[PDB]
Write a protein that binds this ligand. Structure first.
Ligand SMILES: *[C@@H]1O[C@H](CO)[C@@H](O[C@@H]2O[C@H](CO)[C@@H](O[C@@H]3O[C@H](CO[C@H]4O[C@H](CO)[C@@H](O)[C@H](O)[C@@H]4O[C@@H]4O[C@H](CO)[C@@H](O[C@@H]5O[C@H](CO)[C@H](O)[C@H](O)[C@H]5O)[C@H](O)[C@H]4NC(C)=O)[C@@H](O)[C@H](O)[C@@H]3O)[C@H](O)[C@H]2NC(C)=O)[C@H](O)[C@H]1NC(C)=O
Ligand SMILES: *[C@@H]1O[C@H](CO)[C@@H](O[C@@H]2O[C@H](CO)[C@@H](O[C@@H]3O[C@H](CO[C@H]4O[C@H](CO)[C@@H](O)[C@H](O)[C@@H]4O[C@@H]4O[C@H](CO)[C@@H](O[C@@H]5O[C@H](CO)[C@H](O)[C@H](O)[C@H]5O)[C@H](O)[C@H]4NC(C)=O)[C@@H](O)[C@H](O)[C@@H]3O)[C@H](O)[C@H]2NC(C)=O)[C@H](O)[C@H]1NC(C)=O
Ligand SMILES: OC[C@H]1O[C@H](O)[C@@H](O)[C@@H](O)[C@@H]1O
Ligand SMILES: OC[C@H]1O[C@H](O)[C@@H](O)[C@@H](O)[C@@H]1O
Ligand SMILES: C[C@@H]1O[C@@H](O)[C@@H](O)[C@H](O)[C@@H]1O
Ligand SMILES: C[C@@H]1O[C@@H](O)[C@@H](O)[C@H](O)[C@@H]1O
Lengths: 208, 180, 208, 180
């Protein structure tokens, strides 16, 4: 029966010195008859014993789901270490292993632009600011908005798109009260990407 | 106009390892067990010099041998320490840097530097009264790299250093304040 | 072994009178030992015999993949007819059925805006036009660009994103030669969505 | 100023079914087996009246009973027939419509109509010399719905009709040119 998926940490948890990047193995289709699952973790084939393995959550299908989260070192992800989880369970005719690492690839920092609202919107209750982030490799990226350091609630990012020169782009949209976009006020799109000096850039503007 | 710079431990990102003579600094692999305070740069491997200048001409040298990333320059005493920020004269920093095989001046947006001979040591020159910060390539007979002019220092200045992250493994080498 | 997935037609093939909408059943993990698969199709439980069922393509895993495409009536999709495929094969302990229909939901036409390039780009080789399409339900939508009726090659759409008021948005990006954006020239974002009068709107502009 | 309008078969989207007297039209469920030509609207269920006016005052009525979508008005002889286009005075159409429970005038962008009594029949009035197209609610004692003024007809005009798609099933009813 059971199946295993492995997931990378968030690029922002890796780049930001104070955050904690985690690699995750998820075992699904664990039968309720045979709930016990043993999960072993390895970094460059060196076994480690630090994973939080969460009380095998229950699922609809009437199956169990096992989530094991290995906290890792920032340096280990970016240096290309291999993270491997090994999964044992009675119903497995033999252990399942999954491996993941950060792939080599070119690194290209994104260009970041903020676009003001379109003209016709200028007379609506809310307006919409757009952050356009283009030209970046690899595709892992984090984008958010603020206004004088207060991080904004109401923005949504698209997922990245493989552009035609093989780089990635994405857009981030922020809805704000028209009132704001006029009087004083500052809005900033912050982007975190490994190609950017000190990992981050923010682009700003307001009322023209 | 050489001046003897030492590092101010209290300003150092808590992951930096500063020698006893406070003349060298390297990025450590672990949080370093120094107490938090408001002066200490939180998000980046940066540190200030202990010295503070408000007038005159000051010059110092920094060894960057084998390093793949760093920022160097001067900056206002009153610059931001916590959270995310960019190095630019608006924010109180006059710096240059090496990042991913390019040399840039910390203008906004940043300015591409044209350096023929990659430097192993850099000289930083501040002339407070003239409103000038200049950078010099010591490996290349002291040739000019970059000159910020009409600077608005707006207060006391401090020597500024970024050792660089070393998530890659290629940037463990330290910054050294050079044998005067 | 084998598994079945069912897929809707493209919203544009349904809305456009001359195009041919198709519903698709895809059977994967067909073993090379037992290649024959029988697929039956039904519209509102009325069996139909019009599907093109394609020579069970070969796949890497060393399995076969069966693709069966049922052409349907425009009216049948929009009226909420049920399309069902029934799949038989030796390795199936009993037939597999999959059903799909167009779900009821509110219909909200998108607002469509075109944004000019960001200022700093104004001095680059190419510039980037942005079409911003917001406020639409349901999420199915088609977007492309033209310039005086010549459909553009080099644009990329993001996938739609569930916005915070429960509507959808997306962005479409077009790269053009700076030269063009100056002299004369017209660029148009065309959107097809079921909420729009006659199914379509185009928003235009050029050199300001 | 009533005028007797009949439909021009040669202009009809090939899915439309036009009565023998050419006074009614409905959207059929299938392509309709009429030969293609350059006059025939390709993408939408539209059709023109046979008549062409270049002067004077003309008035006619259209029955829209039970219909959930339609466009009505007048338009230039030279309007676009093929591909995708919008109804607007710029493109040569002065129209109003019913679409998804709203009534709109075909301005660009479109203008929301305020109709108290949903109409089952509409009167269209063109005054060529005054540059006016107006629409009237016959169900509601002929009250005004919409007036286009300063129109730039720029040529011969033809009565214009869109029966509406009927992918939903709620819009099979025909348009009828009304018993004068
Ligand atoms: C019986 O029911 C089960 C559930 O019904 C079925 O389980 C499903 O089985 C599928 C296989 O047939 C699985 O498909 C795979 O899915 C992969 C993508 O999975 C991710 O995204 C989907 C949504 O798109 C989501 O539902 C999953 O939970 C999973 O989400 C990701 O989870 C990881 C790890 O938790 C997150 O990464 C971590 O995030 C944390 C913070 O939250 C930290 O940041 C960590 O550092 C970081 O590592 C990640 O963020 C999260 N992503 C999102 C978008 O949420 C896909 O790659 C594979 O290709 C494959 O398609 C499916 O995942 C699984 N669903 C669940 C919920 O388990 C079961 O198959 C069925 N049985 C049968 C017999 O049919
Ligand atoms: C051994 O190998 C096999 C291949 O290795 C494995 O097969 C895979 O099995 C997975 C299940 O474990 C399948 O996952 C499902 O995928 C669903 C999404 O599939 C669509 O998108 C993916 C890419 O995202 C794509 O690879 C698939 O081909 C499929 O693409 C869609 O295909 C449909 C029908 O062809 C298209 O719709 C039609 O389009 C035409 C025109 O092209 C007309 O317009 C028609 O009108 C229209 O209906 C559709 O456009 C197309 N979409 C895209 C984006 O391309 C997902 O919904 C499920 O949730 C599930 O996750 C996986 O699909 C399958 N892959 C393939 C290629 O078969 C096999 O499992 C493995 N065996 C084992 C034991 O592991
Ligand atoms: O579960 C199947 C699914 O998950 C894994 C991925 O590698 C996908 O490409 C694949 O379709
Ligand atoms: O193959 C499993 C996959 O395909 C089906 C969908 O309903 C998904 O949500 C699911 O994860
Ligand atoms: C079919 C999908 O995948 C499985 C589970 O993740 C979810 O319940 C979802 O319904
Ligand atoms: C694992 C993925 O799904 C399966 C096949 O669709 C593809 O080859 C892909 O490798």
């Amino acid at each position: 029966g059971p199946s295993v998926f492995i997931f990378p940490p968030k690029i922002k948890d890796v780049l930001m010195i104070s955050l904690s990047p985690i690699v995750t193995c998820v075992v699904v289709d664990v039968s309720e008859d045979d709930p016990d699952v043993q999960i072993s973790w390895f970094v460059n084939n060196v076994e480690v014993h630090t994973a939080q393995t969460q009380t095998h959550r229950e699922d609809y299908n009437s199956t169990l789901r096992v989530v094991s989260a290995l906290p890792i070192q920032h340096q280990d992800w970016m240096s290309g270490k291999e993270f491997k989880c090994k999964v044992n369970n009675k119903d497995l005719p033999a252990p399942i292993e999954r491996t993941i690492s950060k792939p080599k690839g070119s690194v290209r920092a994104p260009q970041v632009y903020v676009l003001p609202p379109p003209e016709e919107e200028m007379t609506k209750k809310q307006v919409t600011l757009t952050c356009m982030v283009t030209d970046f490799m690899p595709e892992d990226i984090y984008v958010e908005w603020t206004n004088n350091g207060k991080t904004e609630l109401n923005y949504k990012n698209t997922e990245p798109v493989l552009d035609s020169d093989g780089s990635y782009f994405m857009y981030s949209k922020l809805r704000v009260e028209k009132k704001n976009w006029v009087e004083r006020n500052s809005y900033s799109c912050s982007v975190v990407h490994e190609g950017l000096h000190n990992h981050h850039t923010t682009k700003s503007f307001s009322r023209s | 106009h050489m001046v003897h710079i030492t590092l101010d431990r209290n300003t150092a990102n808590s992951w930096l390892i500063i020698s006893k003579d406070r003349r060298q600094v390297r990025m450590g692999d672990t949080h370093q067990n120094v107490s938090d305070n408001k002066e200490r740069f939180s998000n980046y491997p940066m540190v200030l010099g202990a010295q503070r200048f408000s007038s005159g001409k000051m010059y110092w040298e920094v060894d960057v041998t084998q390093k793949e990333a760093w920022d160097l320059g001067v900056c206002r005493d009153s610059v931001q320490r916590k959270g995310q920020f960019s190095l630019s004269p608006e924010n109180g920093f006059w710096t240059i840097w090496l990042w991913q095989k390019s040399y840039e001046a910390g203008t906004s947006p940043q300015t591409t530097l044209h350096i023929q001979v990659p430097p192993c040591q850099i000289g930083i020159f501040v002339d407070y009264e003239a409103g000038v910060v200049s950078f010099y390539n010591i490996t290349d007979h002291g040739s000019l790299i970059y000159t910020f002019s009409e600077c608005v220092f707006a207060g006391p200045l401090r020597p500024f250093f970024n050792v660089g992250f070393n998530y890659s493994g290629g940037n463990a080498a330290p910054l050294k304040l050079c044998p005067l």
